[PDB]
Each structure stands twice: as C-alpha cells, then as structure tokens.
C-alpha cells in the first residue's frame, strides 16, 4: 500500500551537493572558535562514517533480502543516496572549509574513536548477521537501520542545525537539511518493513522482539551519551544534545510501531528554527488559432 508513494517521494527528492554553492559559509566558519570548528568537523566525520556503512552495507543487504522489484528499487535508490550523495556531500563541506591536513586528521580520528567504532561494530554486525530466508535476522537488522536513520544521526545533525538556526553556516546547513529530509523518509520506510515482519510473529515472539529492540536502543543510547559528551563538552552543549537524541529515539521507536521510551523535554528553540519537464511534439493544429 505504500512502496509506490515512497518510490515517487524518493526520486522527486533527488539532489547533488554541487547544486549548493558553499563559498558563502567561508566567513561564518572563519569566525567560529577553534573548539567550535573541531566539534563541527568531528560531528560531520561521524555522520560520514554512518552513511558510508549505510550505503556500502546496510541498504544493499536489506535490498537483497526484501522481496519485490519495487521494494528493491526503493531500497537501492536509498542506498545510492547514502554513499553517492550523503557521504560525498560531507567531503564537499570539508574541502571548502578546511585545509587538507585538518581533513586527513579528522578521518584518522574516526578510525581511532572508540564510540564511533563501537556503534559501527554493533550496527554493521547486525547487517552481516542477516540469514537468507530468515525473517527474524532481517527484522533485527531493520531495527538497527531505523536506529541509525532516526536516532544515531541526530547527535551529529544537532550542530549544523544549531548554527543554521542562528543564521550561521547556512549553505552547509542547507545540505544537512536535505540529508535530514532523506533520512526521515528512509527511517519511516524501513520501519514499515520491520513492522511487517514483527506482525507475522506469535505474541511470545513479539515480546522477545520488543526486548531486542529496547535492549539494543539502550545499549546504543549509553554509547551515544559518551560520544555526545566527548564532542560537545568543549562547546558547552552536551546536555542540550542529549535531550535532542532522546527526542529522536522516541521517533525511531514510533517508526517501529512502539511506544515512546523517554519523557518529553524542551529542545533548544534555535535547533527548532534550524528545521526536466514532460515533452510533447508540436501538432500542425497548435500553429492555428
């Protein structure tokens, strides 16, 4: 009942980072403190890693196991967006704002950062555990994917949105908003596929799947807290970001058909402010009136 409308929405949202000129951010970037620039680079690098694995591994593997040519076409399109559009856009931002050495250093930093490695290990592990014709392993990977789309990106998204909302780094911010618009529909779509599998189960099996989903969320959440503190303490924003990730965790649960898990909190209003034609030939009768 939904794939065709997601297909149409995904293809109509198609974009490339080159559509957005980035040289306009040069001055507001220059004006940020060293702490702010450091957090910003690292935040986008963490996002780049997530999209790299979502494009290389997550979306293609889910596409392989989901039945139906149209469902596969949507998932293939989403996979392309992850690595050919999203992951690449971050390099466009980096290449504009930062010198090569700072770019090299931040990519070295992703490799050695323990929270980023842990979250990649956990998510990719679940993707690679999918067994052919085994719907339960597939469900588990789809939960992981929804948590990546609708929860894990948000510790990263906070900062570009926080600046966009203050009228700073608005070109980079425009790219990020386009990425976020895509991930929101990706999280909903994968969520609907996960619910399909969940709804086939006995009540006993469902109870176990909810346990899996909640245990996984809590494990990812605890790691994300440490990651958030590590990045944001130097810019004074860790508590604010934590509220934001809890907000988005609830959205991820809802995408999976589950009740919200965290209590509602006031999000920084700045971040809230941060949010060819068809051709016919000419007939001889079109020349007369």
């Amino acid at each position: 009942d939904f794939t065709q409308m997601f297909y149409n929405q995904n293809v109509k949202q198609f974009w490339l980072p080159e559509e957005i000129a980035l040289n306009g951010d040069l001055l507001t970037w220059k004006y940020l403190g060293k702490n702010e620039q450091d957090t910003y680079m690292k935040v986008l690098a963490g996002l780049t890693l997530l999209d790299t694995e979502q494009g290389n591994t997550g979306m293609p593997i889910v596409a392989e196991h989901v039945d139906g040519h149209q469902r596969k076409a949507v998932l293939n399109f989403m996979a392309m967006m992850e690595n050919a559009v999203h992951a690449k856009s971050y390099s466009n931002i980096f290449m504009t704002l930062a010198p090569t050495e700072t770019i090299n250093e931040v990519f070295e930093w992703v490799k050695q950062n323990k929270y980023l490695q842990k979250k990649a290990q956990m998510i990719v592990g679940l993707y690679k555990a999918i067994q052919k014709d085994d719907e339960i392993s597939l469900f588990k990977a789809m939960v992981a994917s929804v948590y990546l789309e609708s929860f894990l990106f948000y510790s990263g998204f906070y900062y570009p949105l926080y600046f966009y909302g203050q009228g700073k780094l608005m070109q980079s911010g425009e790219i990020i908003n386009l990425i976020l618009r895509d991930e929101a529909i990706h999280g909903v779509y994968v969520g609907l596929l996960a619910q399909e599998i969940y709804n086939k189960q006995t009540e006993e099996k469902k109870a176990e799947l909810r346990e899996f989903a909640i245990d996984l969320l809590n494990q990812l959440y605890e790691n994300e807290l440490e990651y958030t503190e590590d990045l944001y303490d130097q810019v004074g924003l860790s508590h604010d970001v934590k509220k934001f990730i809890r907000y988005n965790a609830n959205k991820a649960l809802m995408n999976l058909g589950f009740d919200p898990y965290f209590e509602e909190e006031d999000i920084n209003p700045i971040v809230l402010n941060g949010l060819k034609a068809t051709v016919e030939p000419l007939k001889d009768d079109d020349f007369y009136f």
């Binding site: 909302g165 060819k276 034609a277 016919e280 030939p281 001889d284 079109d286 020349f287």
Partner: protein, 683 residues
C-alpha cells in the same frame, strides 16, 4: 523576534476562518514606533539636514543650488503635508532597506519617504519650485514611481547612473567584441543591466582573414561577456546581470541555447548571462508548415550581400539565402528548435523570445533601423545601429546603442485620482529630464543614442491590483477593455507631451521625419478605431476623465505633424521588481503570482499580502499560475497595441503542463501580436 515581525506573521494566523490582514497595518506602526523613528537621524531644521547631507557627500550640490532654501523647504513641506503612511509592513521595509539613504556605517536612516521624494522632485524640476511641488504631489500620491535607479540615486553624490537598461550592438570583429566587453563592464560598473546583440557575430567554423574553421562562434563571446559581467558586479553589491540576444536563423542558435542546458559543460555554460532568441515570422512559418529550415553563417551572408544577416528582412531574404550557393547554411528542424526552446524555458525560463515581425510591424522608427533585439528584461524594443570600432589611433564609426529611461504609473493611484493626463505628462517630463542629465563617458553609442533618440520608457503597474480591488477578473473581457482604454489614454497623453516638448524646445528626435509619427501612419488605427470602453463598468471607472476620441486623435496627429515628437520611444512596461513593494502595488501589468508571499530576511520570516487583499476580493486576486495563459496573452496584446516598445511578459506555468503547452502559448502570443516573452516561471 521584533514586535513588527510578530505582528506581520500574525496575518497567517486565521481568526474566524479569515486572514488577519488588518494586523499588517499594526505591524507598520510597530515598524515605525520601534525601529524607523529610533534609527532615523533628526535635525533641528531642514537647513541643517541639507547642509549635513551635502557636506558629507550624500547629496549633490548642483541640483540643490538651483533653488533657494525657501523653495526647497516649501517642497519638503508639500511632501510632508500629505502625511503619507505605508499601508503594509513590506512597503516601508523595502523602502527603508533598499531606497532610504543611510549613513556610511549603515546603522542610521538619513532619508524618510518624504525626504527621498522631495529630493527626487527637486532633481526632476531642475530649478522650478512649482514643478518640484507638482512632482512631489505626483510621487506622494504614489501616482508615478521613478525606476529603482532614478528613485534610489536621484540627487545622491555616491550613486550609479539613473539608467540601468542598456542595449549594445556588437559588430563582427575582434575590436568590436573587445569594445563590447569593455562597455558592458563600464555599464555594469554604473549599475546597469546590459543586453548585447550577438547576431552580427559570425558563427562557429567561419573564416578569419580567409583561414577556414577559425571562428569560435558566439559562444566564446558569451563566455567572455559572462566573465566580464561576473567581474563587474556593482563593486561587489549585486550579481552582474547581462543578456545576450541571438537571431534564431544564426547557426550558433543551438550552441547559444546549449549554454543554458544543465548538462552543458563548464566551457559551454554561461551562468550570469541571460539569453534571448529573436524569432522572425519566417521561422514561425517554417515551423507551421513543417518545412525544414536553414540556419545561416552570418559572415558568408555579409560577404555575399554586404549587409549583416540580422540587418535585412529574413521574410524576403530567406529564399535568396537558401538558393545562394555562396551562403553557407545548415539544415535544422524548426519544430524541433521550438520544442528545444520550450524545454529550455521549462528547465530554466530561458531564452527570452522576441517576435521580430510583431515588433517591427508596429515599429515607428524602422527607417532608422529595425528592432533586432531586446533588453535584459525583454521590454525595450528600439532601433539600433551597430558601431564600427576600429583599431587604435583610428576614428570609430559610432552607431546607436539603446538606453531608455524607466518610470512606472501606478494604475490604481492614477485612476482613483482621475489624473491619467497629468501623471503621464509629468512622468514624461521627469523621464526627459533624466535622459537629458545622463552622460556616459565610456559608452559612445549609448551616449549618442541618448542624445539623438531621446527615448524614454513610461511603464505601468498595479494593473491586477486595480482590477481586483474593483471587482474585475484579470482574465475577464472587462479587464482587457479597461487595459485598452487606459493604455490608449496613456499613449495619447504621452504622444501629446512628446509633441509639446518638441514644440517648446523646437527639436525632435534624430531622424524623426522618416518615422511613422511624421507620416501620420502611427495614428491610423487611432483615427479610425474608437478605444472608448465597451462595458458600462469600465466607463464608470473612467468617469470624471476625458477619454480621447477619434477626433482628439486626429487633432493629436495634426499637432505631431506640425510640431514633431521629442521622444523616439515613450512607453515600455518594465517588470518593476522592488518599487512595486514601496508603492504597495502589484508588479508591472503581470497578474500576481501569490496572494500572500512568504519571504525570509535574515533569520526572520515575513508575510506580504497583495495590496488591497481582503475576503471580498480574495477571489478576484487570482494567482497567475491558476490563470489561463491565453487570456493573459490576450490582455498583454491589448496593452501592447498601445505601447510603442515591448512589455515584460512572464509566462506563469504549472508543473503539469508540458513543452507542447509552452509552445502553444508562445505561438498564440506570436499570433496575438505579443512582441516579447520574458520568463517561463513554473510553479
């Protein structure tokens, strides 16, 4: 968020299922109680204000020295006696953000609306205190609005030129191409939009000094011009805007068009250079009959006939070009070219379309030259003669490069004051003064044509606003009847004022004797067809104003025959981008795009309803995209029959309609006598 911005955003908040339009008025008050008055520099008296502005190089001494201080004070008092109030927040915001004079530090406001209007009036009158007061009453009643260059820069020492539409002819030589680049840079430095005719330039693969396949075509010239316009960007304030026009029978026409395709490479696409295509009737006939057309190499035609391809009538020359073996040509499909034009306009709104024969069958100055191209806004249509810029230490042959003087009547304010004649004549006088006071020392042909032709463009705006506030649909036959009558009166009084100025000064425009004004042909349709309103509602709208009849037109024709006409061109309807906000008017004669427009300034959102929009006239304020483009074409043709130059005519398309619909609109515009088509804005 400032208080006025909250009061403006409260418009969208619906009370009793209705938009709170009146809240906008409150916003204006806030915008003046909280911001404008606080940041407005006040002086003990007007003498101190004028001394401070003159001494600090804000104003010019020359135009103020023509009056005694008592006369200037009287003009300012006349401006302030109206007690003018901006009816909407966006009007005051646009004026005080774009046109009000600010200090060098851009934190204080030196000029109010009345101050700017008084200064512009004093500049217009050139020493006549009564004329200055008449101009002040004209502009404070908001009946007439000088263009953005004139309104912003009149009386200011730190200013650009008062003309911002420039049309350049480029001859087929490297010296002429370099001179065109230089003149484009100089005119963009002055703040003007520059349009260049590239039809005389020989196509790609032509001979230079009898060596074959040497010319880069018009695309290399377009790359050079695009770089020149990027470089000259008003001292880093606005993006340099330029236009290039090519005849559709030029062989480069595809490559020309290929400069606007998204798939075009970096060495092909020009980003800051608008493109327009000139389409003679011969191309439309070839497409209509599906006969394959020929795009010609201009230099071969020039060698064979001694004249440029765009300098002769293609209707009588096309068969001779095709049958001439010494004229090189390439086979094309005219219907495929039309479909390519429609597709490109769907993608990017380019190119502008100029129907050459539609322009030239009513052109009054065909003896001087036929109109070969238009301006950056595709509404200036004048005779131009190419210049022969020779080598150094050699005398150049200076031709005529078009530069007309813009100014717009506010149809609502003009007609509610029953002052079509007075407003048209005063606007003509102001445009004549600005044309006479324009002296460009780096564009020889522009200066020569300004001195000789004395061409001005008197436009109109708030047509849709006036019609909607009077319970008339823009597509209704009553709206076209009103446009016919109103613009016939505008043409009548513009011609009368031009003839009166010619009689007073004893001089006409150069080569007037060969014009259709001198021969009386121009007045033919005016001495035989009565343009009085055919509907009782429109006649009641025109109540209190004398509507010129056929006898009045005969008298005007005799007056023009006896005394001549001072202006070669008088009327052209410009888009009127930002001045329509300050005047609280709809832009140009175009229908409104949105009933309420949402804009983002800084990090704040703002809401501008169309002027006079309410629940009663919500239906009459139909959006342009929802309208039938054939009826919009009919209205624009009705207006165009009374406008000597063109009208900036933007097509408003839905995303559903295809390139066939766009081509049908273009062909109906060609059939209905539309001279130019500006843009294809897709919703």
């Amino acid at each position: 968020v400032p208080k006025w911005i909250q009061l403006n955003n409260e418009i969208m908040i619906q009370k009793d299922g209705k938009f709170q339009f009146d809240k906008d008025k409150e916003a204006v008050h806030s915008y003046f109680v909280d911001y404008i008055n606080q940041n407005t520099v006040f002086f003990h008296n007007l003498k101190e204000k004028l001394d401070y502005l003159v001494e600090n190089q804000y104003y010019e001494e020359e135009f103020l020295s023509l009056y005694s201080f008592e006369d200037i004070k009287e003009v300012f008092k006349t401006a302030y006696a109206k007690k003018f109030r901006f009816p909407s927040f966006m009007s005051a915001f646009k004026f005080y953000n774009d046109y009000a004079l600010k200090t060098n530090d851009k934190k204080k406001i030196l000029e109010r609306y009345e101050d700017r209007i008084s200064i512009v009036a004093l500049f217009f009158a050139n020493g006549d205190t009564e004329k200055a007061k008449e101009y002040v009453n004209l502009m404070i009643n908001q009946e007439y609005q000088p263009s953005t260059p004139t309104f912003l820069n009149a009386g200011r020492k730190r200013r650009g030129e008062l003309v911002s539409c420039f049309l350049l002819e480029v001859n087929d030589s490297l010296n002429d191409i370099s001179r065109a680049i230089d003149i484009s840079m100089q005119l963009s430095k002055l703040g003007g939009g520059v349009s260049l005719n590239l039809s005389k330039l020989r196509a790609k693969g032509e001979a230079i000094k009898d060596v074959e396949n040497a010319t880069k075509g018009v695309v290399g010239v377009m790359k050079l011009l695009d770089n020149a316009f990027r470089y000259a960007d008003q001292m880093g304030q606005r993006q340099g805007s330029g236009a290039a026009y090519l005849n559709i029978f030029h062989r480069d026409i595809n490559d020309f068009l290929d400069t606007k395709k998204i798939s075009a490479d970096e060495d092909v696409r020009v980003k800051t250079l608008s493109i327009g295509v000139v389409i003679p009737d011969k191309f439309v006939e070839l497409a209509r009959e599906d006969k394959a057309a020929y795009v010609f190499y201009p230099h071969t035609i020039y060698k064979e006939y001694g004249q440029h391809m765009d300098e002769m009538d293609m209707n009588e020359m096309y068969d001779k070009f095709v049958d001439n073996p010494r004229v090189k040509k390439e086979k094309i499909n005219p219907r495929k070219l039309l479909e390519k034009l429609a597709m490109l306009r769907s993608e990017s709104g380019y190119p502008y379309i100029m129907f050459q024969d539609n322009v030239n069958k009513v052109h009054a100055n065909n003896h001087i030259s036929k109109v070969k191209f238009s301006n950056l806004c595709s509404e200036v249509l004048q005779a131009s003669q190419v210049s022969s810029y020779t080598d150094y230490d050699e005398e150049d042959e200076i031709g005529l490069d078009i530069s007309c003087n813009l100014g717009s009547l506010n149809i609502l304010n003009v007609m509610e004051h029953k002052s079509i004649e007075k407003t048209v004549k005063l606007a003509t006088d102001s445009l004549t003064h600005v044309s006479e006071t324009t002296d460009i020392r780096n564009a020889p042909a522009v200066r020569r044509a300004n001195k000789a032709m004395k061409s001005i463009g008197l436009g109109a705006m708030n047509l849709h606003g006036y019609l909607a506030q009077n319970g008339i649909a823009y597509e209704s036959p009553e709206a076209r009847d009103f446009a016919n009558t109103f613009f016939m009166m505008v043409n009548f009084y513009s011609i009368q004022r031009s003839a009166e100025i010619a009689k007073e000064k004893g001089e006409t425009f150069d080569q007037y004797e060969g014009s259709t004004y001198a021969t009386g042909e121009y007045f033919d349709k005016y001495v035989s067809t009565d343009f009085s309103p055919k509907y009782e509602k429109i006649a009641n709208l025109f109540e209190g104003m004398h509507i010129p009849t056929t006898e009045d037109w005969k008298k005007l024709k005799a007056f023009v025959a006896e005394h001549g006409m001072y202006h070669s061109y008088r009327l052209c309807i410009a888009p009127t981008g930002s001045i329509s906000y300050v005047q609280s008017s709809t832009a140009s004669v175009m229908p409104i795009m949105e009933r309420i427009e949402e804009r983002t300034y800084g990090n704040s959102k703002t809401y501008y309803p169309m002027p006079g929009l309410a629940s009663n006239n919500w239906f009459f304020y139909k959006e342009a995209y929802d309208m039938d483009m054939f009826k919009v074409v009919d209205m624009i043709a009705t207006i165009q029959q009374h406008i000597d130059q063109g009208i900036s005519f933007t097509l408003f398309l839905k995303d559903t309609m295809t390139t066939r619909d766009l081509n049908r609109i273009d062909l109906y515009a060609h059939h209905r006598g539309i001279k130019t088509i500006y843009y294809a804005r897709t919703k």
